[PDB]
Amino acid sequence: STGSATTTPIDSLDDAYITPVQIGTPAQTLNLDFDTGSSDLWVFSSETTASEVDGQTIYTPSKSTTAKLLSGATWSISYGDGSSSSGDVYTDTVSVGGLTVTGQAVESAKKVSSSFTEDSTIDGLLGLAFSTLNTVSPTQQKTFFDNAKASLDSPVFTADLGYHAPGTYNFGFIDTTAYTGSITYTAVSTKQGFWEWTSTGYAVGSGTFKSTSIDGIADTGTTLLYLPATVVSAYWAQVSGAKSSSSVGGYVFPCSATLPSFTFGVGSARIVIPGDYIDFGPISTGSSSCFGGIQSSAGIGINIFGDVALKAAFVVFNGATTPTLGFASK
């Protein structure tokens, strides 16, 4: 089997991407944030504290003839950005882009943090990291991809995120028309539950390439590109007037600037992030100071190849017995 679904930016900055997901019988369609950095499929629901729902579409399990309460199961997750959510668990039928899993754990939120309440466009998350990170207790549950994998034509999914435009998540096949050149595959460590890999270095604009190992994660659920302080300083030094602002929480730059590109290495291959992809707009409405899309990982503990990086590539999440990642230009 295969599935194919369009993923759409939630706003004009590409702050996140939502993908429609069918849950239950009859189907209830929710727009979920596909997150290769976590492993829970959770949704706003009829159980979510009313004051914490502000425009999201909810899953109502009592209206699904295939929903079953998973007895005694609860979940609670805290994300790297400080967001969180928790609740109880159903199993139900879940379909993405024509690919169906029966008996998928659907984690129904009773509580969500304010950042989720305030994002009316995100109805929940669909985790695509390794199932060792799933938070359901006392019996850990599998991700949608792990449940689908054996049925798929090939045990893979691909992320093709757009810049200011829709893109695609495919399951079970590699669309050879969606990229240019070849796909370069690179080793993955699953020891932390992430799609963790080692970039071979970087360049800023037309500058020479610096060969240096950068361990980090491929994370579709993180907006920005978080890299070591040395790398990020080298980037922003090429932008007149850019500075790290403690009050704003990262590098900012004059909105009148034209930003240089940023290149990262995948083996001997090179993925070029155009400068415009690094512009996250005014720090507050009407400001002429703009927020940068490349930020230091120093306070995070891991480097993160988030959407800024991934949307410059066609990315293969290869779930073979030994997982690997593939990157192609597009």
Ligand SMILES: CSc1ccc(CNCCO)cc1
């Ligand atoms: C409030 S919207 C939101 C979307 C995705 C995630 C998962 N990624 C966490 C690290 O960036 C957290 C919050």
